[PDB]
């Protein structure tokens, strides 16, 4: 499944908006407001009709998975007492469901009336229902492959502490959609399933060792367990190993029944005792990895490398340091090379690692009209300050007390009047205030030398 375009109308922040998405990775950048969260929420709402067809619906009473009366646009006018709503609120999406199957579906809401959807939105539920039907007829030789939908919000690390099988069955396969678009943490689901997986692997290994007469039947159960573990560990390594050195997440009973990681020089330490960025990244990658493994068990090792779907991440570079920020996107693309990623960030280090066609800059005018444009200049491989000033419009020189004097000195020196006593006094004052090794002062000295050389 893929989404090519999205258009909003009278939604939370935008009177209207049109935004297209790259095929593999898209990054949303916004200096002011909450436009990025609004776009992510709209996309998440547009994907729910598909999940609704698998019995995964508001059975836990998830009211955020539909357009609410709080999602409509309210205009406050100072000179008038009353305040009205903008109706209807609409979400229109274009994309692809299966190979060669292009569609366009819409969701709308009028005032306090219940939300309504058109006929293509119903066909999107019919497709999920027929996929479920094909999954439940396991007495077949053909294989059906399910897509992935996932949402990762900023609250994915808030209350990690509050809260099994793996086979080719409908019940086991459809557990990969459980709370897939939820806004809360999903860490304990993973921890319990991974603990069961490791314990079953070890117990079946010893059972096979003590009586291998059941080879042709039970030695493939252990092989499946090993292949699942290998896929998950490889996916996590792709992100953690090169930067931090930690690798091979496991479950250890001798460490008080905890998940542990290994380091060449620090040994085995429980994950709960590692740094914030490491825990964040591990949770983020593990979510996708085991959902991929549970959805498509017939892809033993290549479950993550051959799975298709859409993943949404808000603040992808949370808690990561600048050296780690320069490698997160490529790590994600290498771990899951068939998934469409839509992320948000405000870090020049991340923006310097993608091409300008994968960046969208969001802005509004006074009346709520929105625009999602590309950067005017190249960003791929450029220095961080270039991206910071050219794209985000921030001067790399901080606004310290001496900035205005520096600008005045630059303007005076570059225009030929550098031998005047006033200019020299300002020069010496700024040298003592900022030091003689300041790059701007150094290039001003170079400019003075060049101008002196020319006059000859």
């Amino acid at each position: 499944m893929r989404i090519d375009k999205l258009s909003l109308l009278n939604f939370r922040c935008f009177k209207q908006l049109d935004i297209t998405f790259d095929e593999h990775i898209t990054i949303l950048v916004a200096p002011n407001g909450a436009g990025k969260t609004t776009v992510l929420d709209a996309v998440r709402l547009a994907l729910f009709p598909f999940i609704r067809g698998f019995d995964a619906s508001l059975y836990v009473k998830d009211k955020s998975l539909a357009i609410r009366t709080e999602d409509l646009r309210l205009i406050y006018r100072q000179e008038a007492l009353n305040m009205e709503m903008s109706s209807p609120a609409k979400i229109t999406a274009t994309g692809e469901w299966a190979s060669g199957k292009t569609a366009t579906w819409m969701l709308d809401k009028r005032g306090e009336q219940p939300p309504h959807e058109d006929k293509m939105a119903a066909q999107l539920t019919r497709w999920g229902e027929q996929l479920q039907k094909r999954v439940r007829e396991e007495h077949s030789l053909q294989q059906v492959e399910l897509p992935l939908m996932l949402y990762l919000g900023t609250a994915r690390l808030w209350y990690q502490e509050r809260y099994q099988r793996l086979d080719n069955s409908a019940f086991s396969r459809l557990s990969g959609y459980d709370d897939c678009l939820s806004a809360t943490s999903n860490y304990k689901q993973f921890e319990q399933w991974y603990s069961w997986l490791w314990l079953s692997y070890r117990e079946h290994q010893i059972t096979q060792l003590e009586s291998p007469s059941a080879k042709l039947k039970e030695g493939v159960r252990v092989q499946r367990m090993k292949e699942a573990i290998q896929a998950i560990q490889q996916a996590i390594n792709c992100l953690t190993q090169q930067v931090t050195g930690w690798h091979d997440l496991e479950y250890s009973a001798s460490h008080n029944q905890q998940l542990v990681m290994s380091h060449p020089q620090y040994g085995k330490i429980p994950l709960s005792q590692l740094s914030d960025g490491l825990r964040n990244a591990v949770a983020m990658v593990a979510d996708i990895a085991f959902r991929c493994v549970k959805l498509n068990p017939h892809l033993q090792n290549d479950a993550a490398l051959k799975t298709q779907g859409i993943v949404l991440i808000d603040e992808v570079d949370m808690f990561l340091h600048p050296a780690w920020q320069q490698q997160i996107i490529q790590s994600l693309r290498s771990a899951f090379p068939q998934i469409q990623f839509i992320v948000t960030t405000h870090s020049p280090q991340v923006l310097s690692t993608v091409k300008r066609e994968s960046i969208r800059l969001l802005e509004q005018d006074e009346n709520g009209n929105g625009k999602a444009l590309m950067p005017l200049g190249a960003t791929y491989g450029e220095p961080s300050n270039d991206v910071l000033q050219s794209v985000m419009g921030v001067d790399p020189q901080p606004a310290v007390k001496e900035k205005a004097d520096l600008q005045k000195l630059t303007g005076w020196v570059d225009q030929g009047k550098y031998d005047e006593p006033k200019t020299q006094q300002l020069m010496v004052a700024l040298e003592v205030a900022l030091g003689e090794k300041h790059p701007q002062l150094q290039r001003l000295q170079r400019s003075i030398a060049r101008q002196r050389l020319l006059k000859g």
Partner: protein, 234 residues
Amino acid sequence: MRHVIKTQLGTVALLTAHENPPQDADQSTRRWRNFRRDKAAVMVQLINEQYHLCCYSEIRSDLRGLGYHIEHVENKSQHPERTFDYQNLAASALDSGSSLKGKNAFGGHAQGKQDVVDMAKFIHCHIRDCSRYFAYLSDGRIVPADELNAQETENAQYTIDLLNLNSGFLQTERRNHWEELEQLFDEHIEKDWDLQQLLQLDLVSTPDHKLHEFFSITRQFFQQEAEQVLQSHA
């Protein structure tokens, strides 16, 4: 900026369209919309006469894949009688038709230039002495020239702010150009090269009517050598 010299009357379609000038905003807008068929030849002539440089920022839009659009020096909503006057038309970057008009647009698409313009204080490329109003700094900024009256400085600052010539993109590009110029200066000092053979690549046009971008920065960087090169070959 750079002074643009016009030496072409125009096109037959443009001349005919100017026979009955529009006399209000609605007529001007409608006829400009209907004139879309013969805009290509006018734009080709405009781009050729400017040596493929933007009329306000002096960038090579073709080399960056940003395009051009026809710009009215004086807004046709202000004085619609000149909607088809060839003397009031120039070519600006950021062709009209995802990076396009917005808050950070510059040149003809700048926010201020779209609303209102005061022709008394506006310095544009069609004024013979526009180049002496501006100076280019080492940090990527553009500022009014020191040798200006207390009245000319206000006009220069107003023009700079109206066209949004100090945006981050332009500042970064100009800073990079200055750095490359410094590199070239050091290279020619080291290699015992001549500082006129090289400068003819940047300051002298080509048979296909093309000039290196940021003409003013290069001319101001080499104070007298650039003037000597220009006088020798122009």
